[PDB]
RNA sequence: AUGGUGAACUAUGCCUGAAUAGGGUGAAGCCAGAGGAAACUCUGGUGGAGGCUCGUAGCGGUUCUGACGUGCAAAUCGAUC
RNA sequence: UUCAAAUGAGAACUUUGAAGACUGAAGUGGGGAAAGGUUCCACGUCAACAGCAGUUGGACGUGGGUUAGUCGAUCCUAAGAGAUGGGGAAGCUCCGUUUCAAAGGCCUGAUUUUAUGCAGGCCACCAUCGAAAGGGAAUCCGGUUAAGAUUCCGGAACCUGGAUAUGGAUUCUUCACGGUAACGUAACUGAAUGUGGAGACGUCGGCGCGAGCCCUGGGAGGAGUUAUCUUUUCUUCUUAACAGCUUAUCACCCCGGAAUUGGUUUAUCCGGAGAUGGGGUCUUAUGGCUGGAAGAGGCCAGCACCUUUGCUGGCUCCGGUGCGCUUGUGACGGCCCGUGAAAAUCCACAGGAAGGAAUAGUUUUCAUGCCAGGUCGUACUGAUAACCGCAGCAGGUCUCCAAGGUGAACAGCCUCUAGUUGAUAGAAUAAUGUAGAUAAGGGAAGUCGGCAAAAUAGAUCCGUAACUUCGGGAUAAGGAUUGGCUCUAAGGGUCGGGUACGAUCAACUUAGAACUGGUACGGACAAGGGGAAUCUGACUGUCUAAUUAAAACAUAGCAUUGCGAUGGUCAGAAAGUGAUGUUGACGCAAU
């Protein structure tokens, strides 16, 4: 049973010193250093992992093209579709009730 | 150590070049009293404190 | 590093003005149970990537080898 | 089956700390770990974190509350009192 | 050879037993096996139509 | 003799507060034109734990009147407030829980919290779990307002001093037996190094005035003057009475 | 007494990291069944709590008032804990 | 530890070979952090040193040796340190780090007088230091040296920064299309300003998936054993970073409409705020196929080579299994008066500034192509001889990997890989010792005292008192059983139903019966003595490092005291100074 070393100079089992044991074409086991796993991007409103978007570390989003980082709505890689729906509904309905408040106030104040 | 500063390494090199015995011809000179190198600095006996 | 499936694309890759070298690797494999056929791999070394084309048929292989450009330095194995 | 006669949740402390203390703790820890009804969604999904904070599993609403129960008697009195004062001003 | 004998049923008595029943095989493991079994049988029957969803529900909770 | 524990607390090297995980200072919004002529609306986004504080905090978000941005503020949560709730702050705001009004604008009997000693300090009184002040009268001349604090003291404050309506959440906290030294440890390792406490009677005379003896005793009256000086103040300081409290206190 | 040097040991706090076999007991919650006029109770399971427990690594350092006691050691060795 | 040989003047100790042994994957193995500093490697060599020896050496002497765009420092900020402005102080200097400061820059035009001013608009914060374990752009394989390697060679990739052109896409519906939708596509303008996310985070428990390891079958090879038996025992049969296609729970969409309530987890949560169901979308940890890449590496055969050192051929295949071990990961659950870092940095969105159509202009977030990637570190040990302990000291000193069997087990015992075989030796077996043991009969009479030692000991079954805070006591006490062999029974998966059951595959656990043995069987190892009672401290915990671990300290609980900020307690030589206080009576301080 082949045993394995850290291939780097840090000897401590830290979060950034993670080690996968991997067989090689020379037939030996070797440590392979693992980068930290990536978190999914989240909606500003609901906090859920929003879909369509890629899970990368931050400076890789610069390497990657834009179809990986956005979907084709307003508020694409920022907000969930149901959150967007809520705020559209809310906008339209409140902007209607604003008109209604205006005319109600007019019809009340112009009574005298 | 092994992940050093250059300052530490610079001093270690001077100590490597200082750790040699006398040239022989210096014993042959006129009005010579230097028989041996007193300031030897082996790594077991005496640490140089950087 | 990148596999290519289309011979048209492969021929442009050969005539891409930065491809100087190439190599032709012959292999020995078998067709799903029974008999050993003869596989061919045309590999062209661009600047960034090695493009390789897998051809399972020696006829297409023979036509393609003659269809290579003349200036390209070919290493047959 | 019923496993303890009277200690209930405070059997995790076993024989330690005294019966009166374990009893006070029992009374409060039940409320602490209970599920309550959401004023907003009408479901029974309100659990606490982090004393004074009561989250609904569904509906994601978070209410400021008591430490081991959602509403204290004082705050109940306060909302009723403030309602009465507001109505005393405008009604 | 000793493995083949233990397979046949040898060297498994009270004298060759130094750990507990739970240590050797936890009752939680045994439970999980049992209930996964019953659970997937019920599911396959409900899918095949050999049993309706109401009996499925009753038997799920009994299991 | 030697310098004692209570003395060197003031140097405060290892007696500083532990402030890493604190979300911030709980402060009311700066008293400005809107909040002293009308009202400004804000949204409660988060209700969040604050380490070393049994009371929860509310992250309220307001708009800046003068620049297009969102200015975020950290309130102490009144009991009953919730995420997605609108918080109205100012002179002409309605009497609802979570709203920030002046104590002149509120009526008598009103229950408030995080109430300014004087206008602009952004909250001083009734800030811990379960606490509130009561308003028990106005003096509209000279714009003052008389209030009961949670200690029982009556105070007189400016009517322009703001206070948030309702009681601060986290109440009932001190009803529960903490019940074990480890829980007291974890309490205080997020506040400061005030725990565990050794007794003067248990230590030597260099280390404390109560120290020494072939028995564990104090030897002198533990009641010690207000005019005592540092190193001599290690009992019941300026104690006007001592003993078990009997009968009606808060005599008036 | 004047002026200075030290927290590489140790004391305490903070910040940032790491380490911690296998077993026993078997708390809340949940399921079924039985009983009861009701209130509610019983039984069997599940579940896996605890500044719980046996016991490794480890951390300490009880007793032998053992070894040693011009030592391996200016505080160690061994067993027992 | 032994034998022989070689070396040499000389061999208990050097080298090689042959044996015998050990450490026994919480290692005498392989790596590293601190620290050391050349101890690394070679050659030569023994005066001293290695508490005997010495031909040997971490010694002596002479030399060689450390190669980086991708590893790290470098950068960020943490706790915190610390300038400036200002203020204190006779002063050395102190406070304080956003402040009672006129504390600057990003772009635009202007343009071919404009150098960089000027017509403008934008912003408000305001040093710097601080982590070879936290955050962080990017590399892998094979080979190579006496000694270096993720650094060299070969091959195959990626990031950043900058230059740039071609193709592609796009437009006269000038800044794209498809999909009901979730969303998709190789592209598919977009400043100031703003919003958001990632960075970015507890611990335990069990379940699931994956990787490697373990175990195992068939076959192609090699080795061993072969008086007899053994289709046998050991061994090789591997595949990187990266790229493309494809693949998952959770989550979401559409249809549809639920009570005879259903779905569903090991764990009971979910559904008219819209279930089950039918059909889809997504994340791509992970896995599969291809490329890389078999021309590599590995195992063999044949041919040769006074040499360089080779040449030529083959094989490198197909599976299975699981409460397995290690590790990662996902979804969940439990716990808290504890709810478990920040910043650099990157992206997205909102917004609609500005600019722009075809006789060619925009895109340098698509593809390809061009150039460059600095400085310092890099050998070795890492510990009973490379560090600290005056020393080659049984002491101390942070971490990674981690095989088979027994067995609950990372225990103990044995073994494979790997590494050691070092610790002054020989001869004898007096007393006294140190360490280990055994003892008739008695049995605590011993001693201050059962100190020491013995006895018990695992597991299964039975059985279990007083007292009790009802939780415990409790492994209470106290008893039985346990081997080997041959059998029996029970406990499952995947496929099939012309709209009651069959075929096929594979685990261990449990119970029982015969039989058998000089009545032995947790056969070594491992492994509680128990009971009745008192004093005392509630408990867990802590301390006199090197004579005192306790009844002392602490603790939860209880009580008192002061204080509403012109404040209480405390600090400071002073201060435009400070801790409590990122505080506010359910708080802080003092007992
Ligand atoms: Zn959302
Ligand atoms: Zn709700």
mmCIF file of C-alpha atoms and ligand atoms in Angstrom, chain A residues 42-50 78-84, ligand 1:
data_model
loop_
_atom_site.group_PDB
_atom_site.id
_atom_site.type_symbol
_atom_site.label_atom_id
_atom_site.label_comp_id
_atom_site.label_asym_id
_atom_site.label_seq_id
_atom_site.Cartn_x
_atom_site.Cartn_y
_atom_site.Cartn_z
ATOM 1 C CA UNK A 42 -26.928 33.605 -4.786
ATOM 2 C CA UNK A 43 -29.929 35.851 -5.229
ATOM 3 C CA UNK A 44 -29.792 39.166 -3.419
ATOM 4 C CA UNK A 45 -33.418 38.812 -2.362
ATOM 5 C CA UNK A 46 -34.114 35.155 -1.560
ATOM 6 C CA UNK A 47 -30.599 33.850 -0.928
ATOM 7 C CA UNK A 48 -31.120 30.764 -3.076
ATOM 8 C CA UNK A 49 -28.582 29.340 -5.482
ATOM 9 C CA UNK A 50 -29.700 30.779 -8.772
ATOM 10 C CA UNK A 78 -28.236 38.555 -9.769
ATOM 11 C CA UNK A 79 -31.825 37.652 -8.879
ATOM 12 C CA UNK A 80 -34.074 34.640 -9.192
ATOM 13 C CA UNK A 81 -36.843 34.610 -11.751
ATOM 14 C CA UNK A 82 -39.544 34.385 -9.103
ATOM 15 C CA UNK A 83 -37.978 37.325 -7.274
ATOM 16 C CA UNK A 84 -38.028 39.265 -10.542
HETATM 17 ZN ZN1 LIG I 1 -34.310 35.110 -4.954
#
